[PDB]
């Protein structure tokens, strides 16, 4: 249900109200399209883990879980 999502960017933002269907892959799908373009790798660390798409449901009966994006732009994209 509640998450608090922090990109290296500095930027956490903490909502109350997450999907069933995806979850994690709406989550990061909604931030990229957010800011109209993807920070580069888009790749957040849930409890240490990957890959999390896969518990989509299984993360909105969590409703506390702190999640952690990181972005890598070497290239570009200050």
Do not use: W
């Not at 509640?2 to 999907?19: D, G, H, R």
């Not at 518990?55 to 890598?72: C, E, I, N």
């Amino acid at each position: 249900m509640l998450l608090k999502v922090k990109t290296v960017s500095n930027k956490v933002i903490q909502i109350t109200s997450l999907t069933d269907d995806n979850t994690i892959a709406e989550l990061k799908g909604k931030l990229e399209e957010s800011e109209g373009i993807p920070g580069n790798m888009i790749r957040l660390v849930y409890q240490g883990k990957q890959l999390e798409d896969e518990k989509r449901l299984k993360d909105y009966q969590m409703s506390a879980g702190a999640t952690f994006h990181m972005v890598v732009a070497l290239r570009a994209g200050c």
